[PDB]
Amino acid sequence: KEPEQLRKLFIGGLSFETTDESLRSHFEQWGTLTDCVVMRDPNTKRSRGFGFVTYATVEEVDAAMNARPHKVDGRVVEPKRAVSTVKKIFVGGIKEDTEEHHLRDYFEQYGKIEVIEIMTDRGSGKKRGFAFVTFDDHDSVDKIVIQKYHTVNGHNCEVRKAL
């Protein structure tokens, strides 16, 4: 079983009318939910406007994220994977033989790429062995940086959020 943290979505921007039950009914469209909670004030029981859902598998999380935008109880909400929000990554260790198509063909499977920037030496124009990739959506980055490994053009790459 995948670690539970990797199976959780934080759902921000809830309708205050959303309940555990309606949040669950919504998000069960994309998978089995092992947990589903709307955060409320301990005293007033008034919604705090966010909650979390936990799916049985990461593929279900992916399904839910791919089904954004989610309108729950009339309001578009903001699902994000639980922490381990940017659209850009640093990709290091790609050396001088890694080209844009290597980066694209790999990373485009995480989501839509807007910019690939292979870093070259300001003086010499030689590849510096790292790149930045900008995606159209943060979940691409969130999926990427939770991976233990990235292999691109046969290189073991170091990938992290870029800001």
From Swiss-Prot:
Which stretches does the entry tag as region Globular A domain?
1-84
- Summarize what the UniProt record says about post-translational modification: Sumoylated.
Q: Which cysteines are joined by disulfide bonds?
A: none
Crosslink (Glycyl lysine isopeptide (Lys-Gly) (interchain with G-Cter in SUMO2)) position: 1, 71, 161
Q: Where is the signal peptide?
A: none
What are the subcellular locations of this protein?
Nucleus; Cytoplasm
Q: Which disease is it linked to?
A: Inclusion body myopathy with early-onset Paget disease with or without frontotemporal dementia 3: An autosomal dominant disease characterized by disabling muscle weakness clinically resembling to limb girdle muscular dystrophy, osteolytic bone lesions consistent with Paget disease, and premature frontotemporal dementia. Clinical features show incomplete penetrance. Amyotrophic lateral sclerosis 20: A neurodegenerative disorder affecting upper motor neurons in the brain and lower motor neurons in the brain stem and spinal cord, resulting in fatal paralysis. Sensory abnormalities are absent. The pathologic hallmarks of the disease include pallor of the corticospinal tract due to loss of motor neurons, presence of ubiquitin-positive inclusions within surviving motor neurons, and deposition of pathologic aggregates. The etiology of amyotrophic lateral sclerosis is likely to be multifactorial, involving both genetic and environmental factors.
Q: According to its UniProt entry, what is the function of this protein?
A: Involved in the packaging of pre-mRNA into hnRNP particles, transport of poly(A) mRNA from the nucleus to the cytoplasm and modulation of splice site selection. Plays a role in the splicing of pyruvate kinase PKM by binding repressively to sequences flanking PKM exon 9, inhibiting exon 9 inclusion and resulting in exon 10 inclusion and production of the PKM M2 isoform. Binds to the IRES and thereby inhibits the translation of the apoptosis protease activating factor APAF1. May bind to specific miRNA hairpins. (Microbial infection) May play a role in HCV RNA replication.
Protein's name according to its UniProt entry: Heterogeneous nuclear ribonucleoprotein A1
Question: Which species is this UniProt entry from?
Answer: Homo sapiens
Its lineage opens with: Eukaryota, Metazoa, Chordata, Craniata, Vertebrata
Q: Which residues of the full protein are shown?
A: 8 to 181 of 372
